[model samples]
Structures are given as C-alpha cells and as structure tokens.
Target: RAARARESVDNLYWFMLAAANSAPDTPAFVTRVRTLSYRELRTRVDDFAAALAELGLDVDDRVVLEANVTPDAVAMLLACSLLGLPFIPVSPETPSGRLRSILDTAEPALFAQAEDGGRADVPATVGTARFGAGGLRVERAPRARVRHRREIVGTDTAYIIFTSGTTGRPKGVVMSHRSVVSLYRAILEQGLITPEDRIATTSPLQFDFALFDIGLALGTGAALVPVPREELNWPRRFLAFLGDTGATQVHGVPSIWRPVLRHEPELLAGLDRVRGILFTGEDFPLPELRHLQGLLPHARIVNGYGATESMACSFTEVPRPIPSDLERLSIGFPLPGFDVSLLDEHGRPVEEIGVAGQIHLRAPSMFSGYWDDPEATARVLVSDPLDPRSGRTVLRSGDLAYRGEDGELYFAGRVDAVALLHAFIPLTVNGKVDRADLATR
Candidate 1:
C-alpha cells in the first residue's frame, strides 16, 4: 500500500527496485533471456522509448510491434506505456488484411512490423517498419517513473485489437491505460501472481487474452519469456523454451492451452519448476482442467475472466477442489477493486440468489471507452435511470448469468448467441431471442 501511496516518481522507482530485487539471478526466460537488475531494466526501457521518440512517433499513436517478445521487445512495450504511445503486437501471419484493418480503424500515425511478418501489400495510410529489428535509438532519456506516468494517462488508449467481427469484418477493441492498469492490479491482488514471478508467455498479441498474460510480465515486473515466433506455435519447442526459461508461471487461453494439455502432457515435465498455471479467454472445460491438475499436483491452476474492453475482472485460484456435478462453472469471485452483480432482464438487480439475468460491474481497473466510437460505447455502457443511485454508469455486459445462493456468480448463456424462432406476429428481438407482447411498432 505504501508503494501505491508514494508520489508517482518515488512509486515507480521503488516498485521497479523491489520487483528486480525479487527476481532470481540467472533466471531463465524464453530463449534463456536473462533477468536484469531494476536499475538496468528501467534504464534500458527509458532509453529505448526515448530512442523510439526519435523516429518521430508521439504519445497515443499506435505502433505495430512485429518482433518476438525479447528483452528489447519487452522494453519497447514498457517504453511505449511509459511514453504514452499505444501499441499492438501481432504474430506473423496474423493476416495482413486483418492487421491493415486494425491500423486503419485506429489510424495509427506509425506502424513497426517485424521484418519477418510477411506483408505483400503496404498501405499508404501508415508508415511501416522496414528494418530487420526496428529498435529505437535514444539520446535524451527520461529521469524517472513519475515522468513515465506523465506520458501515459489512465484514460489514454492502450491498444486496439481486432477480433473476428460478426458481420465478417474484424471489430477493433480499443483498450485504455486504465483497463491495463486495472488488469495489472487485479493480478497483483490475486495470489496467483507476484512481482518476483518469472512468467513465460506464448500468446499471440493479436488476441486480447494473450495480451493479459503478456501484461503480467510487463506491468507487474515479472520477467517475460516470450516464445520466439518460430518457437511459440510448436508444442515440443514451446515446452523446451519453458523448460529452459524455468518460468515459475504459465498462462494461455483455453483454446490454446487445451490442446497442449491434451496432445502433449509429457512436455509439461520439469513440473516442479513451474509454480502456477493460468488459463483465461474461455473458462476451461472441467475435464481439461482436471487433467491438468492431475499432472501438476504440485503446482497451482487459476482461471480468469475478462474481455477486450476490460482485459481482466475475476479469477479462480488453482489447487481448487472441483466437483464433477457442479452445474455452473466456478469462476470464483472478482479480483480486488472489482465489484460484480447478477442482474435481471429489466436491468434490475436479481434479488433472489438463483435469479440470473446479465452480469455487470464497474471497476477502477476497467477501460475508459472505445477509442472514438461513442455510439458503440453508449450502447454497451448504457445507463439505468431506475437505480436511485449510481445511475446507468455500469457496463451493460450483453452476457447472461446469475448469482448463486452463496453470492457467487454463475454462467448461464450469452445474449449474443441466443437463438430464436421467427413469428409472424410483430414481436421484439434482442439479438436472436424473441419475446411476445414486446412488439416494435
């Protein structure tokens, strides 16, 4: 708490020092990337961002990071965060067309692609990186962390990530500094993460969940062993990288983690070295999580929930005793600084414990709003005038769920995926779900 209360300048310095102090000397990161002292890490990051500024980019401008997660890449990310520039890192073959759409929507003033990610077409809308390793060359470096905070604001856009849009067009989710700061805080509060933890991350930066894992290493002072582009996708190679990194923790979305647990359980050996296993994006199927638990009995397993808008919200600590008959997937509870509630169709708070409607909550660790889409932001974050207090400032998560008798939230279904049968009568439709007596005249 004292760290947080300290003035911005004193705070960053102490946090960085404490974090670097906690790390193991000769720590194994992906590719054996070694850990640096607090002084070395901060000095490198500040100088890197300063050098990047020499390239004519300004704060809040989106930068396309094409490089693999190396010490340099990690420094670049912090440099941008510390300098007020929003960054989007993508795996090669992340679909150039997809990458273009994201840059176009955000209209980043500059684009830096890893020389390796192949692009047949380079658009004129943005400047693209042409160097083999486009690292910044800095002159006048920043003096301290307070100066870093001044570069980035809680409301400033952090990154714009594109998802497969329903209309077949990719939807760019614009995240702000507050969203990331909140995610950073949530992980810090949850026992799963600590500043000293050496986290090995191998998620594609394009996906929001992957970014969550990467954020832990960058924002929380944990060493990030990012799997090189070549080594990241392969199961055997990934395990080798993890083994060499000796990372205490590992995180991946269910889509990616499931297959790894299923196909190559052997690769997870050297299990004793890994202290934690974190999975998000989708609440892992119980069977999958159980299998992982059996294999890594010595390690902890955690499940988290969040979306592109607010990168992190809740978590389920590992070493949990999961029951076979549990109806709702146990997502545990919200991380500190987050308050969750299960509401009804009328946007009223569900009074009875089993009543399920929609899940909504406001958090200091949440994002500000869509980069510039006021309409989209207004629709999702609409107000509830009926509430005598707090008003409609709450985020209207289009998801459907409810609180259990024990006050824990349960997952029911999604409002977006609900299907409805067509009726000749003029009935109203909320997505595919239709209700009688509610007719749009």
Candidate 2:
C-alpha cells in the first residue's frame, strides 16, 4: 500500500530528483555566496522537507515563500512541492499592503521569509517561519483550520502565481503539478538547453519567468545561475557576473538589455560564452533588438511569448542579422502539444493574412483557474471558439496579433495598454513590464 501510494504521487520535486540522480556531482546552483551541487542541493531539500513535515502541515496547504532566487529559496520551493504544499513566491521588496492582501487571499499555513532585514510585515494569523543556511525555524504556528487532505496527486495545485488583474486587484493563477511537469517535459524535448549549459536567470522570485527558469535549468539537468538584483541596473557588473559564472544561456525580459546596449556595448560584445538569449513580456523595440543582435552575433536570440497562466506557450527564434527593411518580428508557432488560434471579434477564426485578431491557446500546461474567482476564470478560460459543442476549453489571451503572408504571427499591440518609453522602465513586483506606471509617467 505504501509503495502504491508513492507511485501515485506525481510531484515535480520527483521530476527534479530524477535529473539530480543522473548527474549528482554537477553544479545545480551557482550563487554569489557559494555553489551547490545536485547532490548537495538534494540534501538541502530533504532537510527542509523534514523540518516542514514536523510542523504538521497537511497536503495542499499554501505556503507564502518570501525570498530571492538563491539555493535556499529553490530548496524550500522544492520541499513544498515534495510535501504537497502549494507555494506562493513573493520577493522581499513586496510592500506591506500588497503582502497583506496576498496573505489575506491565500491564508497560507506558513509565511516563510529569508533572514534578511528587508522582510515585509506579516499578520499574526498565519504561521511565520525563517529560512536560510541555518535551516527553517518556525516562530509562530498558524491559527487557520487544517485542510486534512488525504493524498497529493498530479492534479494538485503546485503553485499559485498572482498577477496584476485588469480591475487593479491581484488575481492568483493556480498551476497544477501535472500541468507544469508536462510543460517542462515538452520544453526539454525541444533541445533548447543541454546538461552542460549554465543558465543565468535575471528575474525576481515573484515572477513566473523566474519559476520557468528554475524548471528549464533543473529539468534539463543544467546549472542555474541567478543574477543578483543589485547588479541588474549596472551593465558592467551584469556582464562581469555572467562572465564569472560562465553563463551560456540568459533568460530575462527585453528591458534587461537596454542598459548594456546604451552604456557598455563593448562589454556586451565581450561575452563570448553566451550562446542562447530568451526574452519575454512586451515586445523588444526593433532598434534596440537590432543593436543587441549585432553585439551578440554568435548567440541565438529567442522571443518567448505567453501569459502567466501557462508560464509560456511559444519560443520564436529571432532571425539572425534582422533585415534592414523588416518592420516586425514574428512570435512564430506554438510549442509542441499546443495550438494557437487567432479569432476575430465574432469568435470566428482569422485566416486572411494581415488581419488582426486575439490569440487563443490550447495547451496541456494551462493553469487550473484563477484562485477563488470563477467569474474571472470563465472570462479567460472560455469554451472553444470554433467548436462550442466539443466541450473543450481554451485560454483567451487579450493580446492582439496578425498573421503574415508566411503564416507567422506578428504582435500588433495589447488590448488595454501603454505609451511613453523610459530608459529603465519600472517593473511590477512580479518582474513584468509595468504598464500602469508607464501610463502615469
């Protein structure tokens, strides 16, 4: 019975464990303070999980994890997965008001933060815990009722990623373990990253992009190198860190390269080790993208497009040496096991070239739904536009796009959106392009 129960549990932590078992001695994380091997990292995860288990936390309980992208943070995240706890990642920089809002919504069993002095205020209702090299130490127990769930299954919630909603409130997108595992399995099959590659992740912990980086690296048995937040604003320091870590792949938003292109073009050109660069979120300005391509002539630049609901849906490689007359870049086709359909205002398929339409995605990686908001979830995850009687669901992405003569999709602009271009635009707590702040500026 015990063995059967173990076999039934399809957790993402187990998927990562399989990778670690293959290359136990390989470096799992390369941080500023120290490097952790796959074996060492596994030990840390086990220790963290054991400590959390002692706390009597039940299956499917939520954990509010506040920390940066360090080895400890990654370990705790895995530990939560291993124990069937749904983790909600937040950065130390999150404001008290926002933190309180999330805490009130999630009602997590534990509020775990790093020992850093930047810790945000937390209410006394939820359990409070501190985690670092010293291990997890619970300061207060939660007063909330226990869920008392029996088992953790593949369909169980893995994480609840909160994004800025259209109504000026935050909406949590719940992703299941099976959904995330399926996405990563398909991603690894694309041959994007090899076990020998060192992927440098530039986003904060609160962003789904950061979680995507974590899965992309560990799922492929590659080393994850997290860039410190302080160095992100300084081009030279950022370049130096990449060089020092021998980073081969970089995953970040389009704005991450702006400072490097403007201030230290030569420094950006010097990084010969970088082989792959993936940028997501808003469109990469044409002129700056051209400049970036010129600087990293040898690297393969890929434009990743998708929403937080599915983490990511497509990765389109930017044409090498973009043509001088080219006006827009294509978002390309959806990833394997996914389908994208462009729909007109009347919900009919858009087939004519140059006609703009909304992008609707059908993928196994689709999120469960918005946490506790069925009305909002119904609006996005609607019935299949083409075949309503088929009883299938699809994600109705609000972003607009058009089809080119070559059948490639070109981004036309967002439905409700922004204007002014700043040298360094402000980003949301989740590391997305802050359109709200841009509108005001």
Candidate 3:
C-alpha cells in the first residue's frame, strides 16, 4: 500500500512536469484585479530575470520586493527562483517609519515596487538594477531559457522572509526546501486540497500565513485568488466578491472570520465546494474559534501556528465536538521532521507537561539566519543545547508553550517586551501593546 502511494506521488511529479510544459496555457492565478495562467506568469518571470541580468544582477544577492500579490509580483518571485537570488517579498504597506527602519536593516541590493510593477529610480544604494513595473510591456534584454525546477533537497534555503521585529529592526527569517515539503505534507495530511481546490489568499505578501496559501495554490495546481484590500472589513463587499468568484477555500485571521460570520453568514453559502477552513497567525480565541466550528459544522476547520522564520511549525484540527477547555484548541503538534522541545532559561530541557518553556526546534527546514545582522543572527542561532558536543546551530524560537501529558502543545505567551518596528516579530506579551496600561502596574 505504501508503494502504491509512492507511485501515486510519482504521478504528481509527472503531472507537475506536464503542467510546467503547458504552463503557457494554464491559469496559475485568479485575482479580482487580473488573472494569469502559468505560461504568462512564467514568460514574465523569465523576462524579469533577464532584465535583472542586463542590470548585472548575480546569484545569492538580496532583492527587496515590496509589492502586492499581482501577476507581475508573482512573476518576479519566480524570476528570483530562476536566478537563485534570495527573493524577499515584503509588504509595502508598512508604516513609513517602520519601512525605513527595515530598509536600513535589510540593506538590500535592489528595491522592487510590487503594485505598479515598475522599476523605480531608487537610490543607487538600493541595488544594481531597476526593472520597471511593466509586467508584459517593459522592453527587457533577451533572457536565457528558463530551466525547470528540480526537486528541492531538505537543506537548501527556500525563502528568506522578514517578521515584524518586536525589538528594533525586523528579523529576516530563512527557511529551507525541506521546511516547505514538510509543511505541505503535514497540511495535506489534514485532508483539504485537490486539483479542483480554489484557494483565496488574504494576508499580505510579507506574512508567512499568506506565503503558505500562495505556495499551496502554485505547487498543488489549486487555482489561487486574492481578495481586494477594501473589502477586507466590509462583510457586504466580501459577500459580493465571494459570490462572484466562488472560490472554495477562504484563508484568514480568526478575527476577520468573526465579523464575516456575524454580519454576512450567507457568504459561507457561496463556497459550494468548500471542504474546510484553515486558520492561524494568532491565538486561537476559544469563543471565536469554537463558535465558527459550531456554525459551520459542515466545513472542517483547522488552526496552525508558526513564524516566518520556521513556517507551519504547529497545527491543530478541530472536529465537530471540541473539548470544553479553550486551551485544548492549541496550535497542535510539531510538524513532520520538527521535534518540539521545551527549554528553560538556562536551555535545559523541560520534561514536565504544562510547564511553560521556550520552544526550540531543529530540521532541514530551519532558517539560514537573520538577514544582514550578525548580532541579531547570533541571538537566535546557537549551538544546539541538546547536543552541544555536535556544535551544530539551531534557532532559539522564544515561543512560550507547554506540552500536555498527552503530548499536545499549548500556546502560552511571548516572554519579553515585543515591538513591531523591524522585521522579526518578538511577539507581544499578550498579543498587543499596552504601554500606557503597563505603567500603572
């Protein structure tokens, strides 16, 4: 039976090859703003890469992509893949002060405009090349033939994303190919996606949760869609879009779903093929999460937890009847190939269940290091305390959690002072900033 499944998986590989050949004809993305098949997107990615080449860009260089999830943005991301540049797709919507702070930290070789798809005349300090935002209209140098993607090994850094740095500047998180493979398999094990699967991405391009949805759609042949920015708050606007597009799965922060269910429960009806809802990025609000599960008994609901540094670290699926204890609805267990260890201040392993400690993990999928910051890099990466004799480096994820006797992990709170200035999110003590209230205590 295992052999049969492996054979079936090989079929997926064959299907991917065939699809890549036909990408020119395949629609890879469907957004309200525009739609593009694989062929078109691939063509542009090649052009974009060539344009960068004409500008003398090299592999292993850093490119800051402050863009939206447009077809052009997607193409540029692929271009980075083609050239082996560590593409960093970030959110342009960050506050000006915060954005400047990050730029100072990242010191990227190039700055890309995601919305206009134009190459801006940024300061020379930005990068060596500046390709304008014209998706198809730009006149670029002749590009080399794009090579097909091979199966990524477990250790190659797949992406370098910046998290909301709660300290000073944000921290650039890196992940390897193995990390993604593990996440995809773990999520697929949850039983949701198929070729017919239509996924809608709602998070910003910079956010890790959004990246997961985008990768799922692109790699799995599920048509990916994006919701407009304005309709995000107005349930009526969301209803209009959902009804028109009729995408099967809608990804969101649990907070957004609360209003959707409260104000426009009918929108859920538009999801005719909706198998389930996937959620993460914040604490599992017991009342809100359970209420939705109760409301949409037919749609299977799952909650996941992780940072951009280590994507899809934990996941929990809630069936029709969840436990009465709200904490039971935690982010679930460590993803495949990730072993969750509870550590104390001194880095000693904590074995007692319900004893809160830092979460440390090691896998082929861990991040490369904080982008361009050696001190910050040293802070997160340290000799694996579990086997200091081996002297291998691992990330010290400061997530406060405790595993139950049953081995289920529960989310506690981030230990130190959290800020949102730079890219690395230290995370808040209690999911918010309360400096004014803190002084009183």
Candidate 4:
C-alpha cells in the first residue's frame, strides 16, 4: 500500500510539488490584491517552511490556525503541508467557550494567524502568536545557521479537525498525509472537476468541502471563487458576484442552496457558466430539487454523503424527474476505495435488501482516530470481524441505512432518530397538533 501510495502524492510537500511543477505560470492563490502564481505559491510555501524550521517546529508538531477565506489563509495551509506540520483550523465564528476547549486540548506550540491582528492572544496552549499574513513572517524567527530537518512519513499526522461532538463538546479527528491525498485523488477521479472549471465554496475552511475549493484547485489548475459572508446575505450582490466570477462549479450543503432555490431562483438565470452543482450535509427535498433542475437545465446535479471522519464516501445523482414511486432520495452507491455495509444491532451484516440497520464504513481515506481520546475512538472504530485478514477497521456511522432490492444503498435516518420522525425533520404523524389549534397562543 505504501508503494502504491507513492505512485500517488501522499507526502504533503510532493502534493504541492505536483502543482508547482505542472502549472508554474498559472494562478495558484488569487484575491483582490495578492495573486500567487504556482511558482510564487511554491516559493512562499518553501519560505514559510524554512521559517518554521528556524522556529524549531518539528515534524508532526501541532499548530493552531485561524483565518478567513483569503489568499493568505490558503498559503498558510500550503506552508503547513510543506513543513509536515499538523494544523488545527478554528473558525473565527467559533464561540469563545468552544475556542477555549480547542486551545486547552490541542496544546500547540504556536498559534498562527493568517490575517494581521486578528486576535491578540490565544490562551494557555499556544506559546505565542505569529502573524503571517503573506504566508510567513520571516523576520520574527531567530537567525540560526542550523535548520530543523524533520522527516515525515505518510503515516504522520497532517491535520486535526475538531468536530462538534454530539454531547455538546468539541472532539478532534486526526487525519494522516496519506488519507488527505487519497480523498483528493478521489475528487479528481470523479471527472466533475476540470482546468476550465471555477469552483465556488460557500463554507469556510472549518467545513470539510473546503478541501475541493482550496486543495484540489492546484491539482486541476482550476480557480477558487471565494464567497464572502457579507455577500451571502445580500441576494442580488451574491448573484452578481457568482455571475461576474464566471463560476462553473458549486459545492455546498442543501441548507446553503435552499435559500437561492426558494427566494431567488430567478437570480440563477444570470449564472450562465454554471455546469455542476453538488450538495451534501442534509437531505434535499424532491420538490425543491425539481424546481432547481428546471432553473438550471445545463448543470449536472449530484447529492453527496460523508462524515468528518471521511471525505466523500458516496454520491447519488438525482434522477431527472425522479421516479414517481420514490419518496426519499437514496444516497446511492459507495465510491471507489470505500466499502459500505448495513449492520444489525448485534454487529452482524444485514442480508435482507430492505432491512434497515446501522451503517459501517471501511475506507482507505478515513481519519486515523479521535485526537487524545481512545475511548471515543474505540466506540466508532471497531474490528471488522467480517474481514478474512482480521486487520480491517471500520467506522460505525450512527446513521441508519438500508439497501434497496435493486442493490442500491439508501440512507435512512439517524440510528437514534430513525423511529422518532415520520420521515423528515419538524414532522411526525405520531405527535399531531393542528396549526389552527396553536394560533391562539
């Protein structure tokens, strides 16, 4: 597997190396002012890597990062990849209490700010704050003849992403260099992305889909269309921005896309260049989907499914004019390099086609484990007793699912919520109350 991984780019440096070598003259990072060509991107990354080496950040050392969706943030991420530094990216929008929880747990050597003067201090875990707006602040590091030479393997941790735990706490999911690259390769293989495509990212770096917007662009030589938070609120300006940018691809959750479909389907007529639309995070209703299809007849619409522990594990291309009998949309088949199964309560695999059970996922690009929490990791990850080698590990997605008689996979509800709701949220026939009855209140 290691040898095969080498055939692909698993080493973080080599991942960026491919872009630097292939498209040296093309734009790698673009903002209003700071446009970094592929060559310049590589140069800045190398410069920051050297600064980290001088600052004594060894390979696999953790660093806490905070930045917005800008050229600087993208460069900082590339810099960390070059130096084999595992960075934990926190959202500026993250609550202060949750920020403290991440700070206390990560225990990073340095808290790096990709934006200038974003935050004055980062609590006890970080030793000091380093502001590196244009990728790195080279002047801050000590002048030393000897630079740290740390060797990083594919198994070395590349990133630690903190997810909102079900128990109202934040828990980190650790991912290795190999796993990150594997997911990117899968994205490239899907043929949805091309050099001519300009991808729009609605979510910030804290969200997983940002991987396609920021990481895969370099590989495909595509451009990233960064949508500002403020612009998202103003419907006309947002539509104008998308139209002006010549946005060709869009990846976002259904919630983000629903607003446009509901209130501003007319605005989509201006986005003439859009060719593909991919949605995840929640179930997309069939009625709204039909409306969207009518609005954008040229685009290929795809519904994706995956967790923070894994990238895109499955994809379902909604059938145009969905089958009349189909009430709920199936999440469809597992992608290449991922195995999915429905397991009963006893951990045995379900054989009946329509029998619903808990989902078990075995994938090559899955997260290593939850950071610093073996007990939490143990609960989700279990030995695949069904495996012949006795070495396979699978992720127990608390999501309830079943297989169709046609052999296609279907995502049912959450394991805990499956029996609760009628089908979708905010609806249940068991607890019926008329809308007219509650009007007096």
CA-lDDT, candidates in order? 0.60, 0.85, 0.63, 0.70
Q: Mind sharing the TM-score for model 3?
A: 0.80
Clashing pairs in 4: none
Off by over 4 Å in 1: 1-30, 33-40, 115-117, 130-134, 137-152, 168-170, 218-220, 229-233, 266-270, 384-392, 418-441
lDDT (Cα, tens digit) per residue for candidate 4, span 178-274: 8877877776777667866777777767666776457667677777777765676576777777787777887766555556776798888657889
Per-residue lDDT of model 1, residues 1-441, tens digit only:
001112252122233334545553433234555555545655666666555665555556667666555555555566666556677766565666777777677776556544444654656656655332344532222222222232334566666765555446555667776666666656776556665677876566666655666556645656666655455446777777777767788776554454467668877754578888777654466777777777777887776776666776778774456676665575667777777667676667777867677878676655566655676778777664346376647677776666776777666666876124333422111111123343332
TM-score of each: 0.79, 0.95, 0.80, 0.86
Pairs of residues clashing in candidate 1: 51-137, 51-138, 66-114, 182-365, 301-318, 383-392, 384-392
How many steric overlaps are in each model, in order?
Answer: 7, 0, 29, 0
Per-residue error for 231 in candidate 4, Å, reads 1.3
Candidate 2: stretches off by over 4 Å: 1-9, 144-147, 417-424, 430-432
Which of the two candidates, 2 or 3, achieves a greater lDDT against the reference? 2
Tens digit of per-residue lDDT, candidate 2, span 16-61: 7667778899888887746689998888898888888877777778
Worst 10 contiguous positions by lDDT, candidate 3: 1-10
Which has the greatest lDDT? 2
lDDT of 3 by residue, 370-434 (tens): 77777877878788898888888877887888887688888786777322423121222212234
User: Over 4 Å off in model 3, which ranges?
Assistant: 1-18, 22-26, 33-35, 114-121, 127-159, 176-182, 185-191, 417-441
